[PDB]
Structures are given as C-alpha cells and as structure tokens.
Amino acid sequence: RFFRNEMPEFVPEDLSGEEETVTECKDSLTKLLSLPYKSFSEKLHRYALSIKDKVVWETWERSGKRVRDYNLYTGVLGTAYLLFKSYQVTRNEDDLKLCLENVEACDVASRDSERVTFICGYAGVCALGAVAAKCLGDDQLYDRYLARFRGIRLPSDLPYELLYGRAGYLWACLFLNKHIGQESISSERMRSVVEEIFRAGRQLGNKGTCPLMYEWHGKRYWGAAHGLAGIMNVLMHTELEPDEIKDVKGTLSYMIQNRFPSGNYLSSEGSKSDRLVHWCHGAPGVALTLVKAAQVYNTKEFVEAAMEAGEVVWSRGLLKRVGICHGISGNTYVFLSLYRLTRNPKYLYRAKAFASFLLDKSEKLISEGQMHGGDRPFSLFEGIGGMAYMLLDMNDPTQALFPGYEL
C-alpha cells in the first residue's frame, strides 16, 4: 500500500513568464516543490542534520555506547555509515571520528559473528572501518581493519544473494577497492567468488529461459535484497567474460519479458500477486539494476525498461513506510538513479517530490500511525537513519548512491 501520488508532474516549460496562477492550490508541500534546487537542498540538509543528531542520540548516547546489533541494516554500523555520509557531505571531521568510534564498537560486538556481507555482516564493519581510517589518514588503523577483512572466509554453505550471500561479501570487496583505489582485497579472491556465482547460477538455470538462477530460503527471488537483481547488479560491477556478460544480459531480459501487466516485477518465480514495490522486492530494486545494466551495456531494452520501472515507482512507490529497504527514502533513489543516467531534470524533480513529501509529511504521518516508522525506528535500513542518509545525498544528486547497493 501507497499514498496516492497526486503531486504535480514536472513542468519543463519556463514560466513567469508569469503570472502565478491565483486559483492554484499553494500549501507547504507545493511551495517546497517550486523551490530552486540551491535552497531546496540547503533546507533538506538542515533537516537531515536534525535527523542525524536524533539518530546519534538514540543509538549511541541513550544506549550508553553499548552495542548489541552492530550491522549496517539495523545496528550501530548504520549510524556510523550515516556519520560517514555526513562527513563526505560536510567535511565535519567530528562526523568521521565519531564514525570510527562506532565502527570499533561494532567490531568488538561482531567477533564470533558468522555474517559475511556489507549490509548484514562483518565485511560491512571492516570495509567502513578501513575506508574511514584511510580518510582520517590513520594507516595503522587501516591495516588493522584490512587484516580483519582479509581474514573473512566463506563457508561452502553460504547463499548467493546480497543480504547473506556471496554477492553481499563481493559487494564489500568492490566497495573497499573502489574507495581505497587499490587492490586492497585480492582480485583472485573476488574473481573466485564470481566464478562460484556463475557456476551455481548456470547449474540451477536453463540457457533456454533464465540463464542464471538462485534460491534463498528455498525461494527463487527476483529482487535486490535476496534475488536475481542484487546478484546481477554486483556482477556488473566486475570484469566479466563475454559469455558471463551474455548470461547477465540474459537473466535481465528474462525478467523484463516476464514482469506483471502493471510493469511491476515479481517477488519470486511464479508469484501470483502484484503487491510489493520496494527496494527489497519489486520495481525499485530492479530499476536500480536496469539503470546499471543501461550504463554498462547501453541497450535500448535496458534504458527503456529502467524508465518503465521508474513509472511504477512514480505511481505506486510512495509507500506508507519511511525507510530505505521498503519505503520512500529508498524509492527516491530510483529517480536519482534515472537522473544520473539521463540527466533529464524530470527525474531530479521526481526525487525532489519524494523527498519533499517526506520532509513535509513524515513526522505527522508516523506519529499518528499512517506511516510505519520502521521496527528499528533509528536504523539505516528501516528507520529515519536512512531518510537522513537520502536527504544528505540530495545535496549532490548526481553523486547519490543507494547505500549498500549502488557503486
């Protein structure tokens, strides 16, 4: 379920060339939407600082700096990452320091952990640690997180998907390497994870239909978090061979040709219900993946499919939940992604409308239960942590990357 999107479509025409139409309804929301970007982004920035502060209060100070959760998704690493994003935007070195203090606590709390991914496990802790240390200029701290990251091993048991599986660990490696700008994690190690991914996908899949196939919890999920999209997405970020490229292209075509009559995407193989429009399941996560296919492959099929997935988000993507995983902050990135790809200000405008909706309405909507605020209300993936993160990323919308998804 979604709020009906009755927000005004983007107007390309230069008006005013007045005169401001008198009978046109002008509330606080419409005034936000009309705002020129410079002051609109400054406004969202100030709001995001208050959210950020609130999140730091609750997850760090109130709790007396004690760490139970730890991971990016719902735990304290979500807070460190938000602090990191804030540092990236503001260059406030106190944000980076606090970041590192949160990481260190997460590290302590994550020994004994068997979680291996960026978003849900220990590779997330180590890769942020190492990147934050590099920014700070602390080489010894860097080596130390780098050694912990390099000690990670993958049970033959692991799944393939993003939250718990190999695409997830491999995502962390790509993230670490891109940011340091070095082969910090070994290219042979990353290539080996890739080959295991194609091996299993090819074994369970049929060259006739979907050339690559996976299962998590015995389910054949299509989406970003546990499905085909998230895996293909990660694979596009590495050096494929020609037949690997065909197989990734193939799996993505398969999904395009086989979506709902509404243009939304199935949660999992033969599902009979068109209901979810989330990053985790549905159009939003898949759109982000097609945008990436579009950038790498430059195919009409992918470009147009990405745009079409964007229309499903535009009409149904205004979820009654605030967050990144399955909410408005997370669906905003669909428009940001389309904007990065096309440079078409209509897509910026669409991200601007979802962000304005959240700033104008979210507090009121959450506090009277018409918007769900996340089970962990201050987490990165469920709570307002992710709204602050999205808000901060609007400051420089062409540099905005869905956290733990886009590289």
Annotated binding-site members for Zn(2+): 280, 325-326
Distance in angstroms (rounded) separating the CA atoms of residues 222 and 56: 34
For residue 57, the number of C-alpha atoms closer than 13 Å in the C-beta half-sphere is 8
- Check: CB of residue 130 under 8 Å from CB of residue 111: no
At its nearest, how many Å lie between Zn ion and the CB of residue 324?
Answer: 8
At its nearest, how many Å lie between Zn ion and the CB of residue 280?
Answer: 3
For residue 84, the number of C-alpha atoms closer than 13 Å in the C-beta half-sphere is 27
Nearer to Zn ion, 277 or 303 (CB): 277
Residue ranges for the known binding site are 280, 325-326
At its nearest, how many Å lie between Zn ion and the CB of residue 278?
Answer: 5
- Check: CB of residue 398 under 8 Å from CB of residue 340: yes
List of residues 6+ apart from 237 with CB closer than 8 A: 171, 174, 292, 407
Backbone angles phi, psi at 262, to 5 degrees: -70, -15
Nearer to Zn ion, 87 or 279 (CB): 279
Nearer to Zn ion, 99 or 120 (CB): 120
* Amino acid in position 222: W
Distance in angstroms (rounded) separating the CA atoms of residues 45 and 173: 30
Strand (E) or helix (H) holding 71: none
Nearer to Zn ion, 316 or 326 (CB): 326
Q: CB atoms < 10 A from the CB of 260, how many?
A: 14
Nearer to Zn ion, 292 or 326 (CB): 326
Q: What is the Cα 397 distance to its own chain's centre?
A: 14
Q: In whole angstroms, how far apart are CA 394 and each of 320, 322, 387?
A: 21, 16, 11
At its nearest, how many Å lie between Zn ion and the CB of residue 328?
Answer: 13
The dihedral built from the CA positions of residue 273, 377, 30 and 346, taken in this order, carries a sign that is: negative
Nearer to Zn ion, 130 or 325 (CB): 325
At its nearest, how many Å lie between Zn ion and the CB of residue 373?
Answer: 14
Interacting residue ranges for Zn ion, rule: CB under 5 A: 280, 325-326
- Check: CB of residue 198 under 8 Å from CB of residue 155: no
Nearer to Zn ion, 173 or 313 (CB): 313
State both tokens at 118.
């960026």
Distance in angstroms (rounded) separating the CA atoms of residues 82 and 79: 5
- Check: CB of residue 82 under 8 Å from CB of residue 388: yes
